[PDB]
Structure 1
Amino acid sequence: GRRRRLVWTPSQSEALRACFERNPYPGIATRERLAQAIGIPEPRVQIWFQNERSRQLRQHRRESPEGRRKRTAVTGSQTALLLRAFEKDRFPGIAAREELARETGLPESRIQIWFQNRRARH
C-alpha cells in the first residue's frame, strides 16, 4: 500500500510553479519555507520538484547551489531495528514505514530513503 495521493489546490499549484520557475533546484530551506507557506509536508514538495523537473526536461527535449537537508544521524540502535525489518521485507508499505518511523523517532521520509539506499547496496 502507498500513501494517500494528494490533490493540489489552485493556490498550492501556483505557488509550486512560481517557485520552480525561479529555481528548479531548491535546497531544504526553500523547500521547508514553501511547504509551510502552502500547507503541504516538505517531503511531498520535494517529490513534486523531482516530478516537475522530469516533465520539464522531458518536454524540453521534445520541444527543443543551495544547501541540502542536513545529514540525519542514525544510531546503531535504530539501524539494527531498520536492518531486522529489511531482512523480512525490503519494500515496506507506508504503514510499515510509519510503523518503523514511530519506533525509531526518525521521520518517515527518511525511512523511505534508508530503504532506497539499503536496497541498492545490500
Structure 2
Amino acid sequence: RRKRTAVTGSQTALLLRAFEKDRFPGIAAREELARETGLPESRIQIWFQNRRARHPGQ
C-alpha cells in the first residue's frame, strides 16, 4: 500500500479536461500534467487508468 493521494476538486477538473483531449497520455504529457496539477506523474497514470475503466467519455 502507498499512501492514498488526495486529489482535489480543481485537480480532478484539470484531469477531466486533459482526458477529453487524449485518454492515453504518454509519459511526457503526463509529466506536463504532473507539473500543472501538482500530482506525481505516477498518480496521473493511475487516474487515467481508472477513468478509462470506469467512466470513458462524458
What TM-score results when the alignment is normalised by the length of structure 1?
0.44
- Residues 64-100 of structure 1 show CA distances to partners (whole Å, capped at 9, x for unaligned) of xxxx111100000010000000011100011110000
Question: 1:30-55, CA deviations, whole angstroms, 9 ceiling, x for partnerless residues?
Answer: xxxxxxxxxxxxxxxxxxxxxxxxxx
Large movers: runs of 4+ above 6 Å: none
- Residues of 1 paired with 2:14 and 2:22: CA distance? 13
Which structure is richer in relative contact order (CA contacts within 8 A, separation 6 or more)?
Answer: 2
Q: Is 2:57 aligned against 1:114? A: no
Q: CA RMSD in A?
A: 0.5
Alignment partners' CA distance in 2, 1:106 and 1:85: 14
Q: How many aligned residue pairs are there?
A: 55
Distance 1:108 1:93 in 2: 10
Task: State the identity as a percent.
Answer: 100
Structure 1 regions of 5+ residues with no counterpart?
1-67
| Corresponding residue of 1:104 | 37
Separation of aligned partners in 1, 2:27 and 2:3: 23
Q: 1:115: how far off?
A: 0.4
TM-score, normalised to structure 2's length? 0.91
How far 1:105 sits from its partner (Å)? 1.0
> Which structure has the greater CA radius of gyration?
1
Where does structure 2 lack aligned partners over 5 or more consecutive residues? Answer: none
